Design a protein around this ligand. Structure first.
Ligand code: HEM
Ligand code: HEM
Ligand code: HEM
Ligand code: HEM
Ligand SMILES: *[C@@H](CC(=O)c1ccc(OCCCC(=O)O)c(Cl)c1)c1ncc[nH]1
Ligand SMILES: *[C@H](CC(=O)c1ccc(OCCCC(=O)O)c(Cl)c1)c1ncc[nH]1
Lengths: 141, 146, 141, 146
């Protein structure tokens, strides 16, 4: 449950993550595949080679979706409704993996936005990604 | 992990009373019903749209017996779970592309079935032994992922 | 999102538990202490031996909270508000532990309800306990 | 469980330029801020009311130094982390009552801190090596619990 402060911090931090959507999203994905190999079981249909077009494009798809959620942080359920249905009825990624990607996103943000990644912002981002994950898994069963 | 001597005996003792085929179908079925996203790996089994459909699906039952049969054979090597399941570990990763988290879920579902089936005899200490076992098998099945 | 159907078979399963709720709650606790020793770190002030009156006592409170949530299943956040506040700001039990006790509660119900514990009811009970867990951790941060 | 020769090399290479003392206080501080329930063990550290207060608390830094110090020494014993923290594991269980999950959370906070601190240098491959290390340490510290 995102406090007005969390929302403020999230909007502010996610600021620079804008133009670097595909790059940061791609980096977050690569970090996950290398750090948590089991997550690659969801992408056997992808060339997971460093720098592949598939990983760069999916990275952008993920980052853009988060940019959206940030933009409509006060009505996240509806904004992510289509994405929620997709992960719930088709992709069916085990819930545990959202925490893994969320962590790699935080790591990506930390390595790219040193000025913005303060302890308070860190905590808000973490809560934010956990919220998004909750929405994305809210229709699983 | 390593089960103690008084736990290895509780597991074997209880497993001797089990009808593998019966438990396997039950466990796999409940897995697909309780955590429906696991149905992502069995689109070939056909209809799994409702609890009754899943529990009555012949392909789910048939696969349940193979899974619990390999699980059963593994109980003969509770000290070498990783080496005993090394081959199936590679299969699930390289050919089946199955997230190892799934083994954890099946393990908990299996525990619920054993309790449901054995009632009182599935004591806290017996459950403890089995929780160690399922965790071991899951860890063994996930060991060869890369 | 507990469906109107999850609630119904939950109310049905719990209705069958009836006056055994307390006993089942203590049993679920013992099951957890034996199956997941790390949960014992939260009860250093308790004697955790089988038959422990402290465990039995706690078990009844845990059961009562559950019986109450079932009575107000359509609005559990309120029914559990006081308790959620207690675990979040004082007890501070790591969220991961709620799934451990939940699993053990399921095992306990399964071991006592031969007829009631059907696949559908097992599914509804799991969602119910995950829901209770979510409510009890909802104020952690 | 297993780091490759190159992975352990990357870990020590990057760590060699880490002031175990300073990073220690930073990791523990963020832990208490991001996952505030972890503060349950430090009601005697004083003021922990704000992120700034937590981050600048000498007791927190002092503990962070102590905690990361054992971590660093463990980096010198990667082929056997269990034995390395065996006695430390027993202490955290029997006298401190620290839920091992706290070790996992600190591990991920530490990875984030390393990323924040080293930026670009904390590449994906380097992160992967450290993830193995923090998992290894956590598991080792939890191994003696009973
Ligand atoms: C922060 C949480 C996540 C976000 C915001 C997210 C977002 C998305 C988006 C935008 C798509 C593209 C849908 C489209 O084409 O319209 C997608 C697809 C997908 N997601 Fe998620 N996702 C999340 C987490 C995960 C996780 C944890 C996994 C697995 C480890 C995962 C696996 C997939 C897969 C397999 C696809 C299909 C990609 C393809 O075939 O092109 N997602 N996700
Ligand atoms: C105790 C854990 C498990 C064991 C020991 C195990 C064992 C096996 C075995 C021996 C087979 C080969 C069957 C045959 O070809 O005759 C198999 C196949 C398979 N397993 Fe696992 N399995 C386990 C858990 C799981 C879980 C939890 C999932 C997924 C949620 C899974 C998904 C699969 C799939 C998709 C196949 C292929 C079935 C087919 O299309 O023929 N397994 N497993
Ligand atoms: C299924 C969810 C749970 C429910 C419904 C629940 C319910 C309760 C209730 C009603 C109380 C006492 C209320 C009071 O006296 O004010 C309590 C106390 C407590 N709970 Fe929770 N609890 C749950 C899960 C957990 C878990 C997972 C742990 C840790 C493994 C935990 C640890 C504690 C502790 C340490 C106490 C203090 C007991 C005492 O000192 O008497 N609880 N809980
Ligand atoms: C990387 C993991 C960690 C390591 C290697 C570690 C190491 C240590 C060491 C070396 C001590 C001193 C023991 C002695 O010689 O008396 C200690 C004390 C302690 N640790 Fe851990 N620890 C870790 C994580 C944590 C975490 C995350 C918490 C809790 C959130 C925790 C809570 C404590 C407490 C409360 C003490 C006692 C402090 C005091 O008495 O001043 N530890 N730890
Ligand atoms: C609000 C977000 C919120 O209040 C919240 C964020 C993060 C956690 O971390 C717990 C980790 C352990 C676990 O997930 O099991 C918690 Cl408990 C709460 C929010 N929730 C949904 C939508 N927005
Ligand atoms: C909704 C209930 C619901 O549909 C649901 C129940 C349980 C899970 O389990 C996964 C949890 C994993 C974790 O703890 O991170 C899911 Cl994904 C969905 C509901 N009712 C009250 C609150 N939410």
């Amino acid at each position: 449950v995102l406090s007005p402060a969390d929302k403020t911090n999230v909007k502010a931090a996610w600021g620079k993550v804008g133009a670097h959507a595909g790059e940061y999203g791609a980096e977050a994905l690569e970090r996950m595949f290398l750090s948590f190999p089991t997550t690659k079981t969801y992408f056997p249909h992808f060339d997971l080679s460093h720098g592949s077009a598939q990983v760069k494009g999916h990275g952008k798809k993920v980052a853009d979706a988060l940019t959206n959620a940030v933009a409509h942080v006060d009505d996240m359920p509806n904004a992510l409704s289509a994405l929620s249905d997709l992960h719930a009825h088709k992709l069916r990624v085990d819930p545990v993996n959202f925490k893994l990607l969320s962590h790699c996103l935080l790591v990506t943000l930390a390595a790219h936005l040193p000025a913005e990644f303060t302890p308070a912002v860190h905590a808000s981002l973490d809560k934010f990604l956990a919220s998004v994950s909750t929405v994305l898994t809210s229709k699983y069963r | 992990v390593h089960l103690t001597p008084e736990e290895k005996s509780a597991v074997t003792a209880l497993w001797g009373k089990v009808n593998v085929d019966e438990v396997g179908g039950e466990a796999l079925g409940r897995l697909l019903v309780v955590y429906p996203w696991t149905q992502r790996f069995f689109e070939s089994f056909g209809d799994l749209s409702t609890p009754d459909a899943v529990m009555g699906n012949p392909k789910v039952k048939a696969h349940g017996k193979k899974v619990l049969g390999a699980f059963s054979d593994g109980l003969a090597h509770l000290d070498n779970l990783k080496g005993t399941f090394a081959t199936l570990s590679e299969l699930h990763c390289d050919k089946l592309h199955v997230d190892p988290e799934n083994f954890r879920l099946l393990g908990n579902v299996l525990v619920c079935v054993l309790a449901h089936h054995f009632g009182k005899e599935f004591t806290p200490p017996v459950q403890a032994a089995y929780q160690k076992v399922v965790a071991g098998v899951a860890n063994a099945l996930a060991h060869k992922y890369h």
